[PDB]
Amino acid sequence: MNDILTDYKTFYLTHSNIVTYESSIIDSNTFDPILYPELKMSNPKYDPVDWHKKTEWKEAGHIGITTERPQISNSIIECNSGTLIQKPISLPNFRNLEKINQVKINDLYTEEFLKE
Amino acid sequence: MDKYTALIHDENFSTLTLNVSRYPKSLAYWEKLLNYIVKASAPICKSTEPQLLKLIRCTYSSMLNEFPYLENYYIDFALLEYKLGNVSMSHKIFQRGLQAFNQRSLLLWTSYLKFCNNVISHQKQLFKKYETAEEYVGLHFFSGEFWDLYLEQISSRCTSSKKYWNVLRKILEIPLHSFSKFYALWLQRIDDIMDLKQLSQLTSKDELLKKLKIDINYSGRKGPYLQDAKKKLKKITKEMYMVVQYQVLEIYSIFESKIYINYYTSPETLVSSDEIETWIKYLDYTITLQTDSLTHLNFQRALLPLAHYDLVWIKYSKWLINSKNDLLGAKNVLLMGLKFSLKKTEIIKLLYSVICKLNEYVLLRNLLEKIESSYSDNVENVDDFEIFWDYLQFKTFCQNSLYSSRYSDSQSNGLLNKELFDKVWKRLSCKEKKSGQEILLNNLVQFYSKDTVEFVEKNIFQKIIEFGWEYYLQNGMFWNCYCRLIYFDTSRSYLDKRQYIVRKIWPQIDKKFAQSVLPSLTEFCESYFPEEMDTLEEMFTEEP
Amino acid sequence: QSFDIWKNLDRIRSTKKNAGQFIKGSLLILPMRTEDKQQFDECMDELHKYISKDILRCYPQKEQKDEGMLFYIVLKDFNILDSCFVLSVLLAFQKRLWMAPSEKSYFRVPKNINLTGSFYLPKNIETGSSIVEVGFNVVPDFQQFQVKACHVSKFMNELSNFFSQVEFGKCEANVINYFKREYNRTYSQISLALYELPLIGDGLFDIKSYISKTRPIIETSKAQMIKHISEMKAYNEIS
Amino acid sequence: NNCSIFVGDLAPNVTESQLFELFINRYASTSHAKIVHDQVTGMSKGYGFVKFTNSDEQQLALSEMQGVFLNGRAIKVGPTSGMSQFIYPVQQQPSLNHFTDPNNTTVFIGGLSSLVTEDELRAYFQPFGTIVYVKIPVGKCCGFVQYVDRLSAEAAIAGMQGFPIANSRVRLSWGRSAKQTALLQQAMLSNSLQVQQQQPGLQQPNYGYIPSSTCEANVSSTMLPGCQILNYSNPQQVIMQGSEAVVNSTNAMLNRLEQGSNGFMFA
Amino acid sequence: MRDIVFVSPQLYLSSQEGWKSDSAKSGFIPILKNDLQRFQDSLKHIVDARNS
Amino acid sequence: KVFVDANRFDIGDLVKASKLPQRANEKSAHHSFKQTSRSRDETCESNPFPRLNNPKKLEPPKILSQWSNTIPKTSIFYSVD
Numbered sequence A: 001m002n003d004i005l006t007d008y009k010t011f012y013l014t015h016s017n018i019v020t021y022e023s024s025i026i027d028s029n030t031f032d033p034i035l036y037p038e039l040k041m042s043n044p045k046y047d048p049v050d051w052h053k054k055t056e057w058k059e060a061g062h063i064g065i066t067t068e069r070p071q072i073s074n075s076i077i078e079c080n081s082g083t084l085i086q087k088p089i090s091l092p093n094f095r096n097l098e099k100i101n102q103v104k105i106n107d108l109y110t111e112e113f114l115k116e
Numbered sequence B: 001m002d003k004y005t006a007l008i009h010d011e012n013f014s015t016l017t018l019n020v021s022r023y024p025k026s027l028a029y030w031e032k033l034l035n036y037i038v039k040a041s042a043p044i045c046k047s048t049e050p051q052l053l054k055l056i057r058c059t060y061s062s063m064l065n066e067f068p069y070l071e072n073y074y075i076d077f078a079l080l081e082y083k084l085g086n087v088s089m090s091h092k093i094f095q096r097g098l099q100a101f102n103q104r105s106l107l108l109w110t111s112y113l114k115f116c117n118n119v120i121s122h123q124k125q126l127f128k129k130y131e132t133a134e135e136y137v138g139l140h141f142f143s144g145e146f147w148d149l150y151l152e153q154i155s156s157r158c159t160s161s162k163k164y165w166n167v168l169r170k171i172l173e174i175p176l177h178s179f180s181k182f183y184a185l186w187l188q189r190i191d192d193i194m195d196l197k198q199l200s201q202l203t204s205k206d207e208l209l210k211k212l213k214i215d216i217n218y219s220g221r222k223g224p225y226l227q228d229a230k231k232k233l234k235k236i237t238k239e240m241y242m243v244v245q246y247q248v249l250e251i252y253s254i255f256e257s258k259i260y261i262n263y264y265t266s267p268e269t270l271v272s273s274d275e276i277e278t279w280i281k282y283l284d285y286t287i288t289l290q291t292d293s294l295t296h297l298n299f300q301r302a303l304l305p306l307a308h309y310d311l312v313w314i315k316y317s318k319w320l321i322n323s324k325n326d327l328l329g330a331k332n333v334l335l336m337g338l339k340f341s342l343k344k345t346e347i348i349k350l351l352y353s354v355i356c357k358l359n360e361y362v363l364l365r366n367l368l369e370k371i372e373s374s375y376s377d378n379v380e381n382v383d384d385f386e387i388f389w390d391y392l393q394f395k396t397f398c399q400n401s402l403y404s405s406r407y408s409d410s411q412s413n414g415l416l417n418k419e420l421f422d423k424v425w426k427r428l429s430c431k432e433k434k435s436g437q438e439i440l441l442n443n444l445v446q447f448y449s450k451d452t453v454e455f456v457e458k459n460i461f462q463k464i465i466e467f468g469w470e471y472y473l474q475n476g477m478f479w480n481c482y483c484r485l486i487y488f489d490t491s492r493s494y495l496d497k498r499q500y501i502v503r504k505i506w507p508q509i510d511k512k513f514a515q516s517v518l519p520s521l522t523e524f525c526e527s528y529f530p531e532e533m534d535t536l537e538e539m540f541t542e543e544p
Numbered sequence C: 001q002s003f004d005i006w007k008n009l010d011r012i013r014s015t016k017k018n019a020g021q022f023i024k025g026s027l028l029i030l031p032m033r034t035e036d037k038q039q040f041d042e043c044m045d046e047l048h049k050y051i052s053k054d055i056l057r058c059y060p061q062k063e064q065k066d067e068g069m070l071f072y073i074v075l076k077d078f079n080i081l082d083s084c085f086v087l088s089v090l091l092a093f094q095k096r097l098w099m100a101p102s103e104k105s106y107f108r109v110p111k112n113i114n115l116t117g118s119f120y121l122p123k124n125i126e127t128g129s130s131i132v133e134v135g136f137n138v139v140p141d142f143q144q145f146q147v148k149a150c151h152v153s154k155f156m157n158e159l160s161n162f163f164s165q166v167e168f169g170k171c172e173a174n175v176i177n178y179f180k181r182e183y184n185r186t187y188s189q190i191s192l193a194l195y196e197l198p199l200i201g202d203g204l205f206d207i208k209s210y211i212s213k214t215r216p217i218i219e220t221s222k223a224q225m226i227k228h229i230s231e232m233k234a235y236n237e238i239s
Numbered sequence D: 001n002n003c004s005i006f007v008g009d010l011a012p013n014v015t016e017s018q019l020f021e022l023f024i025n026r027y028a029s030t031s032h033a034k035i036v037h038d039q040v041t042g043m044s045k046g047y048g049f050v051k052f053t054n055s056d057e058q059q060l061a062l063s064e065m066q067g068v069f070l071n072g073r074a075i076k077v078g079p080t081s082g083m084s085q086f087i088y089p090v091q092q093q094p095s096l097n098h099f100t101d102p103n104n105t106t107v108f109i110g111g112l113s114s115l116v117t118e119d120e121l122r123a124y125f126q127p128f129g130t131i132v133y134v135k136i137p138v139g140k141c142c143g144f145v146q147y148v149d150r151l152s153a154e155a156a157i158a159g160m161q162g163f164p165i166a167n168s169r170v171r172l173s174w175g176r177s178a179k180q181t182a183l184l185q186q187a188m189l190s191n192s193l194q195v196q197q198q199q200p201g202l203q204q205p206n207y208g209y210i211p212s213s214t215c216e217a218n219v220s221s222t223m224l225p226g227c228q229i230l231n232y233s234n235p236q237q238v239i240m241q242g243s244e245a246v247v248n249s250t251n252a253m254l255n256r257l258e259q260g261s262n263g264f265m266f267a
Numbered sequence E: 001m002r003d004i005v006f007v008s009p010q011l012y013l014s015s016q017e018g019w020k021s022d023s024a025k026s027g028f029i030p031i032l033k034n035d036l037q038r039f040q041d042s043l044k045h046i047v048d049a050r051n052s
Numbered sequence F: 001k002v003f004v005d006a007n008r009f010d011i012g013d014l015v016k017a018s019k020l021p022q023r024a025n026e027k028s029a030h031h032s033f034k035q036t037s038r039s040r041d042e043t044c045e046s047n048p049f050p051r052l053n054n055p056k057k058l059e060p061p062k063i064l065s066q067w068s069n070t071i072p073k074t075s076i077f078y079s080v081d
Helices: A002-012 A018-023 A108-114 B005-006 B011-022 B027-040 B050-066 B071-083 B089-098 B104-121 B123-137 B144-157 B163-171 B180-190 B196-201 B205-210 B223-256 B273-289 B291-311 B312-320 B327-337 B345-357 B360-374 B385-402 B423-427 B436-445 B451-467 B468-474 B478-487 B494-504 B517-528 B533-539 C005-014 C038-050 C082-101 C152-163 C176-194 C207-213 C215-236 D016-023 D054-062 D117-124 D150-160 D180-187 D245-260 E036-042 E046-052 F012-017 F025-031 F067-069
Strands: C027-032 C057-060 C069-076 C116-123 C131-133 C142-151 D003-007 D031-037 D043-052 D107-112 D132-133 D142-147 D173-174 D230-232 D238-240 E004-006 E030-031
Touching: A002 D245, A018 C082, A108 D107, A108 D173, A108 D180, B005 B050, B011 B027, B011 B385, B011 D016, B011 E030, B011 E036, B027 B050, B050 B071, B050 B089, B050 E030, B071 B089, B071 B104, B089 B345, B123 B144, B123 B291, B144 B163, B144 B180, B163 B180, B180 B223, B196 B223, B223 B273, B223 F067, B273 B291, B273 B312, B273 D150, B291 B312, B291 C005, B312 B327, B312 B345, B327 B345, B327 C142, B345 B360, B345 B385, B360 B385, B360 C082, B360 C176, B385 B423, B385 D245, B423 B436, B423 B451, B436 C131, B436 D245, B451 B478, B478 B494, B478 B517, B517 B533, C005 C082, C005 C152, C027 C082, C027 C176, C038 C057, C038 C082, C069 C082, C069 C176, C082 C116, C082 C152, C131 C152, C142 C152, C176 F012, C207 C215, C215 D132, C215 D180, C215 D230, C215 D238, D003 D016, D003 D054, D016 D031, D016 D043, D043 D054, D043 D180, D107 D150, D132 D142, D142 D150, D150 D173, E004 E036, E036 F012
Parallel strands: none
Antiparallel strands: C027 C069, C027 C116, C057 C069, C116 C142, C131 C142, D003 D043, D031 D043, D107 D142, D107 D173, D230 D238, E004 E030
């Protein structure tokens, strides 16, 4: 896939013009044949375009092992104190405070290779 | 004579100045020269010569324009200008220092605010400056000194005793390194309460009535009522302390206990393979949190030690492209990456695609003009082929952009332009000094027409046959590309081009030069000419 | 709707609920680049015949590169309609030179072109979609704003929805020359950085001391790598 | 335990050998002993630290040496270590499995269709980083991909997850090597200990190497930090990173496209 | 300022105009006026490799 | 030049002025350790590689001792020594 994308970046920049290029740009999947073969080099899957329950928030700091870390729902770390002084801030809403010691591991190596 | 005239006629000053101006990116020479100039003025005051003070200011300005990532030297020259009487020039030095890191350097904000605690003579302007530092750099991991200073200034200046509670309540949700001091201040300030009516300093009364089921105006015996208030607020603070403690403990025990260097040493330094890897891991963690100020802060923190390694520049550019769809930001990232990185290949190659997505092609032509003028129109004799080839792709794109097509079937002219073919032929004539010879030979055969293939085979290949150069006649990949040029024609039949390749190419090549051609031609013959294998075998056999 | 500028101008004059009042203390700067000057001059003369001198001003470069010119278009105390008109004309013209060299109409925008551009505004803004802000801007004082991949009517509606929410005020007097000096300084720095590109090897890094400073260190690191490979081979060996 | 005792007010003619003889081999076993001398003069300041393995032997030595004759003066061998709010955090260990090892850089791949080869499975995991072996078990529809870097393993798991190889979805996790798997199978057949071993490190610091960097191919290297200095070879040895690396990689990928268009290799 | 000259090798080794000046321009290194020939004679091999 | 607190520009003369000149001989003969006075003239040539010259591991984030019983007892990665 890297060889195909590098050969397409070699061939397309030497056999095309801006008139063909600007008509090929669509906004449904942000497809641009100059820059899209560069971003697709690292990962095989790539999408062009509820975060706390996905498979990326859970294994962020460490890969392979999943965990549900505790966070604060009404986090005020982004709002400046010039806006937080306008009104008194409500109580902090809590979640995942019952899994501060519990971690689970999708052990495939023991179950599929050792114990068959 | 004064110290300035003795400083001019001294023998060591000229040698140090020539060693600085001989290699400008050797920071130890700059520091030795700066220490010698400061040693030349052993009393530093306002009664010294201004003709030497202007030279000190020019030396510091040249050092800070050559090395803008030095954190301590902006502080040094700013407090030098504060020692020399004025503060407007010191404020200008602080502003250009904070602009050198683009408002995301903790040490310069800390030193500028310790400076501004005495020199501002205005309270609302101090609050606007500290809130600017809060919204830009206030999410730093090691920012305990900044927030301790800001809480000290609130506790010293404010008399309403309300903003301190607000800022400390904000700090009790921020993952700081030195965080338990703020929790200890919070717990001893809950102990320092005097009545129930101060609970409105924490939250509103409806949030106390709904979440904690407690009223402010509940009159009666308020002893155990306030004790139950303290216990429930201590339980909520303990839960939020467990959350922030797990976050800080995770960030420390996985990431922050590995990075040992957090400062800009020099453009000549070397950073270990552990620390680069842990910066990449920490920024991969930082992207997931999706807090934008903290993410840009940690990317600037990773640009602090190792901006010359070009990995975090390209990573932060790709993050601004795909995760935010903010591509002018990535354009400015790649523009500032040209000023620091030494391996300028991949940053300029990505910046080409960034400019081409923006549909600003006059900017692309003005950028390529700087490359073709940086060599004084001698891009064909460059040692690094990765610069010239990334230039040549987009220059061919620009030549297809300006000029119209020459051939049929809507085929625009590629590398065979009058401003492009000469640059290729100037590089192909070296034959041993310039690498990337077969890359052009595999990329000049990608037209596949009737007259254009004849044009390519007439300009270079027939000319190589006519001159008979040793390097291309020895290499079999040259003849492999030449056979691939004819065999993939779209106008000829199979029998005529097969008779062409068999009869009028293979007897033309040399028999004693076939020792390096036969491993490259045997693969092509096994590929496309199966019945022509034993014919080529009887031509290159061991006996005459 | 249509592909004409004036019909969308009539539409944006009609249903934007008394949008004739301009913005107090309003400023916009559009730096653009053209390959040639003679094609630009006719469109700019038509623009000065349409837009007055007090609202819009133009600033040339110093001709240092001699190939790529840089022209500032400063819109000062502008209304919301003239801004949309000027940005539509300039965003059509700086891309028509690459897409349509044979159309030959400075006020008719075709359908195959998408408007994508970048314009600066002062920092003192208050917003309290296709136009986005930027992160990590290169200008110390000004904020860069991006529009991407729009038709004519979408460009009109998005620029009007952007300028109906933002609130300008209290701009500095000769801030144009300040932006000129800062822009020239920044791009002269990156041009000098591109001039430093052939000067990497043996030029200005003090290689004579840098070889001797790292000569035992790379050797010990290579010995550590060889020991790592041998220990990995002993670790993966069953034996 | 490593209990530390601080001897003080020693004489000038008392080196580290006399303190080690007076501390160790007297009803105890002192692991280390160091007298804190001057930074530039070389003379001892009269203080020294003695770290032993057991706390009871160090306590008995501190109780027996309290007032003993040490080179004409007192020993003062009282302990140095062992109501504030601030205490350092202490943690236990995850007992060293193959998940909680930060030096564990080999990825266990499973869910294969028993159809992919070894060179093709090398070609799946080649640009993520340098690699050492791609051998797979036969009949077990699984394999092992060991890198050198841990960030390369992170990139491989973050990219290759959910990627179907030969109409069969992949399962990526962690795992040990083949010899450690054989040791775990030999210790699990009798079920005595079933203990694992940590993967060895890199003997850090390492200035020359840049992580997630591949190179397939005289050398006049300037050793500049912006470029790459050293790299691991592709099988294996250590190579000096030359300037003609992207050229050789481009020639290699053009040769790979030419030999893959015909069918001389499937990878 | 007398007995000074501002110069940078980034504009001299690239062979551009304005590579030397007498006034305080941001980004230039101040050297002595009588040692400018010693500066030009020091970077001879880089200019010779640039021309050849 | 900044953190040494003796080569500071604005308040370094205050440090160099009142040394508390120790007119008692016992106040000068009591301390027998090194001064480790870092001069301003220290350049980048000294200590080129900060990892070869043995640094210190940074201190952990300190936690409250009254709320120390709620720490996660199981770490994420295996740390040795």
